[PDB]
């Protein structure tokens, strides 16, 4: 796939994602915040169509993501990230997509996920985390 | 404890 | 050492 | 003045700003690293005109400020920062402005300065620096 | 804010 | 078990702790570097014994932990640590006790592992780990 | 003088160091607390005598030092630091020593001052601070 | 790159 590293920004204000439930995750677009101000990042699209797109919208400052998890599979072959579920302080959105294959789990007790990075072809082939207080 | 990024400050330099 | 700020990545998952 | 607040961002690579030999700093704007990319923060200018425009272009990332230093004194009875030195690795931008009054200096010996904050009237008030790794 | 240094903090894992 | 926060150092020199192929990971000390000297925290033992120790002497500085996995499943119905495998830049120690369960991974691109934190009763019950630059 | 680094620490407990109202400032010492417990450091002591000693004990957590400020200037042809004064967000202490010669100044908007580096001889030649989150 | 956390570092003042 074609990778992307969206650096690192002051916090998440927006997710949006794609999965489809017979496949894995699909493209990804995040809107960070930049010292008080929304800042979209840009657009990571899938290499094909098909996904349902899943928009999640955080209560910035107050709300932020405190666990990240999912399973990583194989598709057609190749070994993608299938599945994501985002635990907030808040709420929990997901799981979306397979969650099949071997999970994975990011808990943070202290500090804030503040980046993106990784690859995408027709699904999300793997990704990365900035963390920062 | 919010979702705001924390930075190291120093200063101000200006009523001395 | 030059003017790039560095941060702390945890990942990839994606491989496993 | 009008305070302001550039937040934080990854680097610098421009500094923009006036000085009037005969008073003291005028306003300034500084072009910051954004991951990568070139970011233009808001021109916070001085309430009056007469000033010397000074663009210091840093040679990012290879070249970095490694100390900042100048004269706090009064004008009109205002308590500003009537004089602005960089030093970088690479080489001495300054003084500027007049070197009368008391003296600060900010030396770093590890770390890097990632945005500024301060406040610009007439002149310019007081600033503090954000500092990171 | 007190005279603590923070940090950050990943896990824990062990109730999964 | 009884709960465990070692705090944050400067990096890690040595990691002592034992596991039982049978069961699950027992108790655990840390010997951490604390600006350039060895820096032996507490011991934290388990309730029981019968468990093979295992020592992890890392070339400190040169040498880092790069990664850290395991599983977590439940022995005698409590949730426990069964298992853990530690990737350093130079080797993989490990996997020690029995692959059996939920694996975990910890894989990092950039920071260091500088600090442990934890609960220890027959088994390692669960824990943390504090990470920085 | 003989050169020091104390390294990093979770934050201040207590601060010992000697003055001379004729001369300059001599020794130091700090107590540091890391991850909750004291620590005290090496001694650092001026190559002769005749200071007065003065012991500066915080009210950790709740008091920690909000700025740094004093004066550089020559003694018997060395360059030393000749003053020093502590500002805690509960109190001032200080000035110490001689207030003559170059003042500086090091306010803190957020952050801690956790470990300090130097050198000294017959007096304190020059020094550094650490800051963190 | 190494095992070794690092720390920002401002000063030094005794020269000036
Ligand atoms: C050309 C391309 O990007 N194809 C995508 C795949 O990427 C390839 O993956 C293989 C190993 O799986 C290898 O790394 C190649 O270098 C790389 O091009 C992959 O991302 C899949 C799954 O999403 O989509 C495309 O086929
Ligand atoms: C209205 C205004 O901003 N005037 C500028 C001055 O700001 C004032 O400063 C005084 C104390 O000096 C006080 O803080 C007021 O609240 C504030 O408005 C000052 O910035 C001067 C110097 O540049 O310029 C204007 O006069
Ligand atoms: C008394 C004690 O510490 N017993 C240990 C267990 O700890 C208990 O665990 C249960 C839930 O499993 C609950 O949290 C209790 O508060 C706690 O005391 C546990 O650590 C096991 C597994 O190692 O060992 C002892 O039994
Ligand atoms: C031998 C020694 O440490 N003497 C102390 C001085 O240190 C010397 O300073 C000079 C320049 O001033 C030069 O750096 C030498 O390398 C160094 O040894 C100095 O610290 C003074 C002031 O405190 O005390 C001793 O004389």
Not at chain 1, 7 to 36: K, P, Q, W
Not at chain 1, 58 to 80: A, D, N, Q, R
Not at chain 1, 117 to 127: M, N
């Amino acid at each position: 796939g074609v990778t992307f590293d969206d650096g690192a920004y002051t916090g998440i204000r927006e997710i949006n994602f794609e999965y489809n439930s017979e496949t894995a995750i699909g493209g990804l677009r995040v809107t960070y915040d930049l010292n008080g101000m929304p800042f979209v990042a840009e657009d990571h699209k899938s290499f094909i169509t098909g996904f349902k797109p899943v928009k999640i919208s955080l209560e910035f400052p107050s709300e932020y993501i405190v666990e990240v998890s999912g399973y990583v599979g194989k598709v057609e072959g190749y070994t993608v990230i299938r599945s994501l579920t985002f635990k907030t302080n808040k709420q929990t959105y997901g799981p979306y997509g397979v969650t099949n294959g071997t999970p994975f789990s990011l808990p943070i007790e202290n500090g804030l996920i503040v980046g993106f990075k990784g690859s995408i072809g027709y699904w999300l082939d793997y990704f990365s985390i900035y963390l920062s207080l | 404890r919010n979702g705001k990024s924390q930075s190291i400050i120093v200063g101000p330099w200006g009523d001395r």
